[PDB]
Amino acid sequence: MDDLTIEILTDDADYDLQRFDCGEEALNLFLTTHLVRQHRNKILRAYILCRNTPERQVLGYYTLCGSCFERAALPSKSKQKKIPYKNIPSVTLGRLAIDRSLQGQGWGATLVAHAMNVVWSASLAVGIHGLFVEALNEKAHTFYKSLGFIPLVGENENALFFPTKSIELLFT
Amino acid sequence: MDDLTIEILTDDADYDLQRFDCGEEALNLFLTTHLVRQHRNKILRAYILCRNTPERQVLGYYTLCGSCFERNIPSVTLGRLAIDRSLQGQGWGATLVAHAMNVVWSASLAVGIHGLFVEALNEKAHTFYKSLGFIPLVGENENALFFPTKSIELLFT
Amino acid sequence: KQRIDLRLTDDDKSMIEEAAAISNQSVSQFMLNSASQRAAEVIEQHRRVILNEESWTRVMDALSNPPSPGEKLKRAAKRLQ
Amino acid sequence: KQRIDLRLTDDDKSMIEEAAAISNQSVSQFMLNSASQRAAEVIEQHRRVILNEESWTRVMDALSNP
Amino acid sequence: KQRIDLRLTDDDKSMIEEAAAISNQSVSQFMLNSASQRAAEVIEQHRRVILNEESWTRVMDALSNPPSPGEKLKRAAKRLQ
Amino acid sequence: KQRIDLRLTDDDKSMIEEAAAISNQSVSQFMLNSASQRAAEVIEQHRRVILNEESWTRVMDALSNP
Ligand SMILES: CC(=O)SCCNC(=O)CCNC(=O)[C@H](O)C(C)(C)COP(=O)(O)OP(=O)(O)OC[C@H]1O[C@@H](n2cnc3c(N)ncnc32)[C@H](O)[C@@H]1OP(=O)(O)O
Ligand SMILES: CC(=O)SCCNC(=O)CCNC(=O)[C@H](O)C(C)(C)COP(=O)(O)OP(=O)(O)OC[C@H]1O[C@@H](n2cnc3c(N)ncnc32)[C@H](O)[C@@H]1OP(=O)(O)O
């Protein structure tokens, strides 16, 4: 573990996958088949945290897609005018996971910093208002909230937000 | 003429359709260029007030069609109803509305019918329909009126 | 059976061909289905009486408290008999 | 002016001939307007999908190794 | 341009023929148009995030006056440098 | 049991593969379920329209006479 890197998935699909275990087999079985299929279908952008060696065994990953958000129903919009805004762009961090080997070593927060880094560099190229993340349980929820993310409540509960302005701030 | 009657258009197309004139070029033209075909395409049932002449001189007409009201709930609409200038002022439009109501009523015994909407072009027709019982509607429906089937039934008691 | 000869400008025909191509249909079939669906839709929209708040209220009140037939309509329905 | 012919089924025409009389048009103008309105519909929806794919490509290309 | 071969049960085929005749398309046209439209709307439904009243409120509040990154996030940012 | 030939445009197929990957299905499963549930919708709407015209002919026979 002297030589970890985080690269975009090189589409060739030449990594070492099944020798990975993050502690919960939904993310595991997502990496098993879903991750490469959905990366090469361009539904997500799959970043791999692995070792800088020819063998290239995976120790973590995250997934970044584009997204767009919208309110339920805009009420009482006759104040002055209404120019509709229906495709409000954002980035969504689909799922993130570290191997059980590297748990507890800040590596989830650094993967988050890397994802926010890519989101920032994209914000310079296209319009992005903020970063949504999903949290399937109590622990991912607390993890994400301890990094600046704001919790949404009510049929949006497992979803937290971090505005791109504060991402710009994180890299002062 | 003590010999005039009201009938369903008998699909003869054997009526004197042209010497008719009721005051409005719109209803005249509808009778002469549409009514036979729209009766034959089942979009309306047309009833003619004429006399037992060689060619059944057309002196009045009305049309009935099935409708629904919303915002399916069944009803009928008296779309158009006109009568020649010579017969006007003598309660013949009231008689044709009564006949259309009777047709709607004898339908309401076989089919569920909640009431009868009616189309009124000018304020002339609006006052006229309003005078027979019809409820004046408002807003986008200001040019329509309604009469419940229950009232049509109370009529014939 | 029957046949309809139609005249459209070059640009009308270009738009019809493009839209018919997006549908994976022929130009003829696209025009036919468009006219058929729109005619059935027009026929439905015709026979429907969309009442507003107050007209709805008034028809409901006429169904709840229906009027008594008036003198004029009474004399007419007698003139029938 | 270009010419395009179409074959109906004697019932279809009735429907058209019915609708053409309601919306106050000819059978010719009615069929033409129906097809052109639907053409605008199809074309604008296809442009919507193309634009969504374009924005998707922009944002996803920006999220890849920037 | 391409090709897909769909092996189809017989009940489903009778049903799709019924429906493709209801829309006066072919079985091929019906199947492909259904596939394309449902694909479009499945993708549109995946990509979007509909926020309710309070979720929308907090997202707006985060956008106007954005927070300061915590010390954990800043340490994480300094690590990968 | 049976067979069908379907020809696409590389924009239909990429989109259909993406929407299959989304919903956790095959492209065969996705296209089949698409056409199938759409056929359900279509047969249902045809049936409702038939019922509308049945009630229409009922009330048009009533307004003619018994
Ligand atoms: C689908 C989704 O999007 S949800 C994805 C989440 N996945 C899961 O929940 C599955 C199970 N777990 C995982 O797979 C993931 O590895 C995580 C990412 C959820 C696991 O968390 P970790 O990566 O171990 O957390 P983290 O990166 O913060 O590492 C532990 C760090 O917490 C820090 N920490 C901060 N505050 C405290 C505190 N009060 N006490 C102890 N430690 C603390 C530590 O400093 C430590 O790292 P350091 O000593 O190097 O600084
Ligand atoms: C699109 C549509 O469907 S709108 C259809 C309406 N048609 C038109 O607008 C075209 C022109 N007019 C016509 O063709 C039609 O004949 C009507 C039906 C609109 C014309 O009205 P008519 O039927 O001739 O008159 P009506 O049937 O009301 O008979 C006149 C009666 O009004 C009665 N009346 C009641 N109150 C009054 C009053 N205050 N002052 C004068 N007369 C009165 C009279 O008693 C009189 O005849 P009566 O002695 O038999 O009662």
PDB file of C-alpha atoms in Angstrom, chain A residues 43 67-72 86-88 109-110 113-114 116 129 146-147 151-156 163 165-166 170, chain E residues 46-52 54-56 58-60 62-63 66-70 72-74 76-77 79-81:
ATOM      1  CA  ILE A  43     -24.469   6.026 -17.158  1.00  0.00           C
ATOM      2  CA  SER A  67     -28.005  14.898 -12.861  1.00  0.00           C
ATOM      3  CA  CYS A  68     -30.742  17.532 -12.777  1.00  0.00           C
ATOM      4  CA  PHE A  69     -33.122  18.468  -9.979  1.00  0.00           C
ATOM      5  CA  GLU A  70     -36.591  20.001  -9.785  1.00  0.00           C
ATOM      6  CA  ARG A  71     -39.167  21.093  -7.196  1.00  0.00           C
ATOM      7  CA  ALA A  72     -42.565  19.445  -6.664  1.00  0.00           C
ATOM      8  CA  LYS A  86     -36.595  22.531 -15.483  1.00  0.00           C
ATOM      9  CA  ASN A  87     -33.183  20.894 -16.098  1.00  0.00           C
ATOM     10  CA  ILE A  88     -31.153  22.338 -13.196  1.00  0.00           C
ATOM     11  CA  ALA A 109     -12.907  11.276   2.902  1.00  0.00           C
ATOM     12  CA  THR A 110     -10.012  11.409   0.415  1.00  0.00           C
ATOM     13  CA  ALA A 113     -12.162  14.983  -1.934  1.00  0.00           C
ATOM     14  CA  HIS A 114     -11.148  13.414  -5.258  1.00  0.00           C
ATOM     15  CA  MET A 116     -15.367  16.886  -5.423  1.00  0.00           C
ATOM     16  CA  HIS A 129     -24.795  23.813  -9.093  1.00  0.00           C
ATOM     17  CA  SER A 146     -19.574  14.810   8.712  1.00  0.00           C
ATOM     18  CA  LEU A 147     -18.017  16.070   5.439  1.00  0.00           C
ATOM     19  CA  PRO A 151     -29.388  16.011   4.709  1.00  0.00           C
ATOM     20  CA  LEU A 152     -32.666  16.033   2.822  1.00  0.00           C
ATOM     21  CA  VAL A 153     -35.729  14.738   4.680  1.00  0.00           C
ATOM     22  CA  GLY A 154     -38.884  13.045   3.402  1.00  0.00           C
ATOM     23  CA  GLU A 155     -38.933  10.723   0.345  1.00  0.00           C
ATOM     24  CA  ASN A 156     -35.517  12.316  -0.305  1.00  0.00           C
ATOM     25  CA  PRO A 163     -23.015  23.101  -3.212  1.00  0.00           C
ATOM     26  CA  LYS A 165     -19.484  26.974  -4.143  1.00  0.00           C
ATOM     27  CA  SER A 166     -18.197  25.222  -1.022  1.00  0.00           C
ATOM     28  CA  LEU A 170     -12.366  23.579  -0.216  1.00  0.00           C
TER      29      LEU A 170
ATOM     30  CA  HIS E  46     -33.168   7.855 -13.604  1.00  0.00           C
ATOM     31  CA  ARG E  47     -31.296  11.107 -14.165  1.00  0.00           C
ATOM     32  CA  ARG E  48     -33.664  13.483 -12.352  1.00  0.00           C
ATOM     33  CA  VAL E  49     -33.940  14.134  -8.602  1.00  0.00           C
ATOM     34  CA  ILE E  50     -37.341  15.563  -7.650  1.00  0.00           C
ATOM     35  CA  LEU E  51     -36.978  17.413  -4.342  1.00  0.00           C
ATOM     36  CA  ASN E  52     -40.039  17.976  -2.156  1.00  0.00           C
ATOM     37  CA  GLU E  54     -38.181  20.914   2.542  1.00  0.00           C
ATOM     38  CA  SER E  55     -35.438  19.200   0.523  1.00  0.00           C
ATOM     39  CA  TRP E  56     -35.813  21.964  -2.068  1.00  0.00           C
ATOM     40  CA  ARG E  58     -32.460  23.304   2.123  1.00  0.00           C
ATOM     41  CA  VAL E  59     -30.834  22.898  -1.304  1.00  0.00           C
ATOM     42  CA  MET E  60     -31.677  26.529  -2.100  1.00  0.00           C
ATOM     43  CA  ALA E  62     -27.133  25.751   0.638  1.00  0.00           C
ATOM     44  CA  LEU E  63     -26.755  27.370  -2.784  1.00  0.00           C
ATOM     45  CA  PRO E  66     -22.855  27.910   0.988  1.00  0.00           C
ATOM     46  CA  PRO E  67     -21.217  26.384   4.071  1.00  0.00           C
ATOM     47  CA  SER E  68     -17.559  26.331   4.954  1.00  0.00           C
ATOM     48  CA  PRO E  69     -15.908  22.920   4.476  1.00  0.00           C
ATOM     49  CA  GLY E  70     -15.272  21.122   7.743  1.00  0.00           C
ATOM     50  CA  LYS E  72     -12.267  16.607   8.162  1.00  0.00           C
ATOM     51  CA  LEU E  73     -12.996  17.428   4.517  1.00  0.00           C
ATOM     52  CA  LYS E  74     -10.086  19.888   4.383  1.00  0.00           C
ATOM     53  CA  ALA E  76      -8.919  14.873   3.205  1.00  0.00           C
ATOM     54  CA  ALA E  77      -8.390  17.503   0.503  1.00  0.00           C
ATOM     55  CA  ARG E  79      -3.968  14.433   1.682  1.00  0.00           C
ATOM     56  CA  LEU E  80      -4.319  13.693  -2.045  1.00  0.00           C
ATOM     57  CA  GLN E  81      -2.128  16.703  -2.959  1.00  0.00           C
TER      58      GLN E  81
END
